[PDB]
Chain A
Amino acid sequence: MEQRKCYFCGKMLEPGTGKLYVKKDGSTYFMCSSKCMSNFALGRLPRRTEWTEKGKIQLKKA
């Protein structure tokens, strides 16, 4: 069972669920839900979004 981390929120994908998104340059992004995929498609960066682990890391930098 492959352990996969959501690219946006940083949550671990539960097995049998979630999405893999592949860009043209071969870059692959795991999405745990449709919400993370939508926020990724809006151009939002995870570090600017407070509820994600990268947003929490950026805020906790202070």
Chain B
Amino acid sequence: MKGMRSNIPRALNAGAQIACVDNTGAKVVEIISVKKYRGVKNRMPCAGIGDMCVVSVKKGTPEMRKQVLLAVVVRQKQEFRRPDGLHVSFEDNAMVITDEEGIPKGTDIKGPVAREVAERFPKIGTTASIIV
């Protein structure tokens, strides 16, 4: 994918149950794997902001639940540094359901998204109310 200007620690590993913060009907999704991630022996798949993950809808509507979907993490509590040396951290982890291309399935995103995902996925940027 296109590079971001910031360095993002891959804070979430497989099995992490992340709040889904769009209006698709998925409340909590669990990371199964991370797209474009080859690991090493014994290392769990790791995802930070801007990464696309295959997820399983753990909570939400019955239609959404138990479905394997794609989601993009837009918030993470683990601190990451912007190019000018400032470290940024959110209060919680958040993701939004998307397709392969990065287009959100929902229409509004409650909460702030990281600017890095807003640039790597412009549609997530336009869909979000505020970009921090």
Task: Indicate if A touches B (C-beta under 8 A).
Answer: yes
Q: Which residues on A are within 8 Å of B, measured CB to CB?
A: 1-2, 4, 13, 15-26, 28
Residues of A within 8 A of B112 (CB): 22, 24, 26
**Is the beta-carbon distance between B85 and A16 smaller than 8 angstroms?**
yes
Interface residues of chain A: helix, strand, loop or mixed (majority): loop
CA distance A28 to B132 in the complex (A): 8
A-B contact count (CB 8 A): 43
CB-CB under 8 A for A19 and B90, given A26-B112, A26-B130: no
Q: Which residues on B are within 8 Å of A, measured CB to CB?
A: 75, 79, 84-92, 111-112, 129-130, 132
Residues of A within 8 A of B85 (CB): 15-17
CA distance A62 to B91 in the complex (A): 36
A-B contact pairs, 29 of them (CB 8 A): A1-B84, A4-B86, A15-B84, A15-B85, A16-B84, A18-B86, A18-B87, A19-B79, A19-B87, A20-B86, A20-B88, A20-B89, A21-B89, A21-B91, A22-B75, A22-B88, A22-B89, A22-B91, A22-B132, A23-B90, A23-B91, A24-B91, A24-B92, A24-B112, A26-B112, A26-B129, A26-B130, A26-B132, A28-B132
